[PDB]
């Protein structure tokens, strides 16, 4: 189950330079209606750039597009990190003695 | 608002080596109500050990306590990692286009 954010980067991650909607469904393993929803939300905050070629969407990673899937990888794995430090702290809070 | 993993860790710096009630309410920021609970389950787990001396109620750190505090701390820095990782992202979702 992800998150907005992890949506966005597996979107991002599948659009360097480029990706039509195939890529992004596949790729994202997202289904068309979820992939219209993000790809418009990406476009909106300059993520991706749209263009039509030959009657079919392309769209196009921007500058902005990269340093977001940079940042959203960055997030991920620190989030991963957080996830084992907690496991670790709640490995040591159980006792055979009660 | 801390959590329980915090609660602890600030008990916990606050028990090496020893520590009375005074030390844990006024160094951990909790009442005596809370300080009863968590030192009951530190205790349980093993992360303090409690005696009676002079008729007060003293605990001190084990090796797994310090091993706990260590690891709550590590999840915290993690944990304050991600907010700023998480800010970063946000940074990125703006527009003024629209």
Chains 1, 2 share one sequence.
Do not use: W
Not at 43 to 68: F, Q, S
């Amino acid at each position: 189950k992800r998150g907005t954010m992890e949506i966005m980067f597996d979107i991002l991650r599948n659009c360097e330079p480029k990706c039509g909607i195939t890529r992004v469904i596949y790729g994202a393993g997202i289904n068309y209606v979820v992939a219209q929803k993000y790809l418009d939300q990406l476009v909106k905050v300059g993520a991706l750039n749209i263009k039509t070629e030959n009657d079919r969407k392309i769209y196009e990673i921007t500058e902005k597009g990269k340093l977001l899937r940079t940042h959203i990888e960055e997030f991920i794995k620190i989030r991963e990190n957080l996830y084992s430090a907690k496991e670790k702290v709640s490995e040591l809070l159980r006792t055979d003695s009660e």
